[PDB]
């Protein structure tokens, strides 16, 4: 395996197995779309590192591409092959990861809505929908298509046309349809916590 001299350096990170959770989340797998992680090169990615849990203290970062789990190559592993490998009983968890960067513009937004105030946005894309990304028709992600200047999002100022939506109130939008994404955004309540990154212009 080399898997060496790539765009980004690789490194074996050991996580101790003394009870408790890893404090990480993974997306991707050969049977999945992992946008915006590895758009040209698919795989398994660390999508979320809990601060400051086991994964965080060990040096794992959001965007990390997992190449091997305890010596087991997982570059072509399905999402469940990867998950099971990470859950298999072992004295110590060895992760060969490649230090791919997190998707550009990755940031969490907390948006406040006054009582009776609407969000004032519309979205495009979604799994098995119409291409929300003009630059890439294979991309089935969720993007902001419109922002009303007077709505909550408009007055907040941070949401804008083009941004990719990743999760809403801790609920992931990956693999979700347009309608499933819409019902999440509508039932969000007084406070919208949304994970976004740059998508298009």
């Amino acid at each position: 395996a080399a898997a060496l001299e790539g765009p980004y350096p690789v490194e074996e990170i050991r996580l101790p197995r003394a009870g408790g959770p890893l404090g990480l989340s993974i997306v991707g797998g050969s049977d999945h779309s992992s946008h915006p992680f590895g758009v040209q090169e698919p795989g398994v990615f660390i999508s979320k590192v809990l601060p400051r849990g086991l994964a965080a203290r060990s040096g794992l970062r959001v965007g990390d591409r997992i190449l091997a789990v305890n010596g087991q190559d997982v570059r072509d592993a399905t999402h469940q092959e990867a998950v099971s490998a990470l859950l298999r009983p072992c004295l110590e968890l060895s992760l060969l990861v490649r230090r791919d960067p997190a998707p550009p513009g990755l940031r969490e937004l907390c948006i406040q809505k006054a009582p009776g105030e609407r969000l004032g946005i519309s979205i495009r894309g979604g799994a098995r929908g119409h291409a929300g990304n003009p630059r890439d028709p294979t991309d089935e992600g969720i993007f902001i298509s419109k922002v009303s200047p007077t709505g909550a999002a408009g007055r907040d100022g941070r949401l804008r046309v083009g941004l990719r939506l990743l999760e809403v109130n801790q609920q992931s939008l990956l693999g979700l349809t347009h309608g499933e994404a819409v019902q999440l955004l509508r039932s969000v309540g007084d406070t919208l916590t949304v994970l976004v990154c740059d998508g298009f212009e």
Binding site: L24, S25, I26, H79
Partner: peptide, 7 residues
């Protein structure tokens, strides 16, 4: 949910 797994 089915596409992101927390561990």
């Amino acid at each position: 949910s089915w596409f992101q797994t927390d561990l």
